[PDB]
Amino acid sequence: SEVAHRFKDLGEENFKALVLIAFAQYLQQCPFEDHVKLVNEVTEFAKTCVADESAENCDKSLHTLFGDKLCTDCCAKQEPERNECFLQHKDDNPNLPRLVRPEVDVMCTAFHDNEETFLKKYLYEIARRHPYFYAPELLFFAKRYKAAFTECCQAADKAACLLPKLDELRDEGKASSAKQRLKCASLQKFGERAFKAWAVARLSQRFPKAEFAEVSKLVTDLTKVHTECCHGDLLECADDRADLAKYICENQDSISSKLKECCEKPLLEKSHCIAEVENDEMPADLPSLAADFVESKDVCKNYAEAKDVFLGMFLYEYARRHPDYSVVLLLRLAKTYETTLEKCCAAADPHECYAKVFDEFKPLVEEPQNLIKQNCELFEQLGEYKFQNALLVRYTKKVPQVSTPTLVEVSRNLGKVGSKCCKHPEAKRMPCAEDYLSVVLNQLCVLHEKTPVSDRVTKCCTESLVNRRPCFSALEVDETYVPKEFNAETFTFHADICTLSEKERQIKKQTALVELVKHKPKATKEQLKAVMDDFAAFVEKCCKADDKETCFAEEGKKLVAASQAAL
Ligand SMILES: O=C(O)c1cc(/N=N/c2ccc(S(=O)(=O)Nc3ccccn3)cc2)ccc1O
Ligand SMILES: O=C(O)c1cc(/N=N/c2ccc(S(=O)(=O)Nc3ccccn3)cc2)ccc1O
Ligand SMILES: O=C(O)c1cc(/N=N/c2ccc(S(=O)(=O)Nc3ccccn3)cc2)ccc1O
């Protein structure tokens, strides 16, 4: 009796929350009350399984049960053809209104008037926009959301208290959503082995005192935990995630010294802590990697007798002594190793063939170090917004088939690497940057997957997970792309532009830049600035003007006319 097991282990509050997240992630377009009725039904039913497991239908699988509730094209099909359909029907870019924040008094009224509904609405709106949000982490976001409203709605300045907390949590969730999106992407588009490897590299860096067999047990469980959430099995996902947090905390002395605090925290806070713990102290006495991977007379034999274990050991051994290296780098190195081993172990004398394999790594390590430095110097100069604009023009030139909204979202997100990473001491910058850029390029990948337009995005996206950043970095301007033309409807200028929020002013200014590039992909920073200058002088003119709409319309014609025959 599955439904009872999960209701018992997770408890009423969490079960009700998980089931809702599941419903809002599948039927993203269905309204809040349609999900509320569905939640009440499964919760009512689960209670009649919790009271008596001996009841009918209580013995059915969660996959079979939840599937039914939605049906009250994918609904026609039955298990296993059932769940795969609803999965394939999840939307990374769902056509939903732009969620607007009400006034603080308004927000505090609704929370006081009804707490549960207020949080069910939060869980609903998030999950429906973010179909791959790590469900257990989402309960932690709700916990904090509730906890912020309890303190700020009773305080004197309800606004200045909550708004920064709301800004901190929404930035944190957008980041959580994007990291978890990459996890699912790695599992579904690349396979269990690609995810296994990624986790082996990270947990090796984070737990360098832990033995390979111990890093293996964790990754096996973490692969289970994440496959489940990505597949939609949110109830067992949240359970197995709690079952791993318990194991880690029991066997701390075999895993890490940075765990003591996390394990004394409540169950939601505990897993959140472990998921992002600081890497432990690297072991003092660590032999050279050459001893086992280059010099050892048994390399090829170990590569033949156990390719998965030996190559797994190499990844673990490099990663456990390289926390200044991004996981994508460590995986490029591990792949390179295996690749050189494939060649050399066929040759007459393999030892001389693969003898200078660590010298074959030398470029692969330098290239990210070169990128991070370059992009951070530009960051200290430009400050962020102008840094996004630089990336904007660069990426628009490489892949101009991509929609302006996707280019503006992604280039803004790429730009955010400077503030996020150039703050750390030079040595800590590469995992931050590269491991963050993979998350942002994964977004460009998932948004493009829905409506493929650029064959270059498709190639870099599908070709590899790990080589994605060098794949885009390597792209030059598109010389085969047919420049788009300007008209009366390219740009739309109204009075409202004047009173825009700073954020929306930037986004509007960036949106025009992408289009300007889409007009002339061979355009130069100065040519683009010249047109961007005239555009600025134009809204300055009409926003100050007596009429506004007549300036915006009259001068609007002249602006697009002057922008066409001059760069
Ligand atoms: O409960 C938890 O959240 C918890 C989390 C744990 N490990 N968390 C990890 C481990 C690895 C990563 S990772 O981001 O490097 N891995 C991946 C995998 C594929 C694609 C992208 N990233 C991220 C989180 C380990 C034990 C736990 O208890
Ligand atoms: O608002 C702005 O920041 C602004 C920025 C503009 N940037 N134009 C360009 C043009 C070309 C490039 S690029 O492809 O050469 N890439 C780069 C990247 C870093 C430094 C220099 N160039 C990068 C930026 C052009 C017009 C503007 O209005
Ligand atoms: O100073 C400014 O406010 C400023 C504003 C500018 N506004 N650019 C805009 C304003 C509105 C739009 S729009 O959203 O109506 N048009 C669109 C939207 C998407 C794709 C193509 N066109 C597109 C570009 C452009 C340059 C500037 O300097």
UniProtKB/Swiss-Prot annotation:
Plasma. It comes from the Eukaryota. Glycated in diabetic patients. Phosphorylated by FAM20C in the extracellular medium. Disulfide bonds join C49-C58, C71-C75, C74-C85, C108-C153, C152-C161, C184-C230, C229-C237, C249-C263, C262-C273, C300-C345, C344-C353, C376-C422, C421-C432, C445-C461, C460-C471, C498-C543, C542-C551. Interacts with FCGRT; this interaction regulates ALB homeostasis. Interacts with TASOR. In plasma, occurs in a covalently-linked complex with chromophore-bound alpha-1-microglobulin with molar ratio 1:2 and 1:1; this interaction does not prevent fatty acid binding to ALB. It is linked to Hyperthyroxinemia, familial dysalbuminemic: A disorder characterized by abnormally elevated levels of total serum thyroxine (T4) in euthyroid patients. It is due to abnormal serum albumin that binds T4 with enhanced affinity. Analbuminemia: A rare autosomal recessive disorder manifested by the presence of a very low amount of circulating serum albumin. Affected individuals manifest mild edema, hypotension, fatigue, and, occasionally, lower body lipodystrophy (mainly in adult females). The most common biochemical finding is hyperlipidemia, with a significant increase in the total and LDL cholesterol concentrations, but normal concentrations of HDL cholesterol and triglycerides. Belongs to the ALB/AFP/VDB family. This is Albumin.
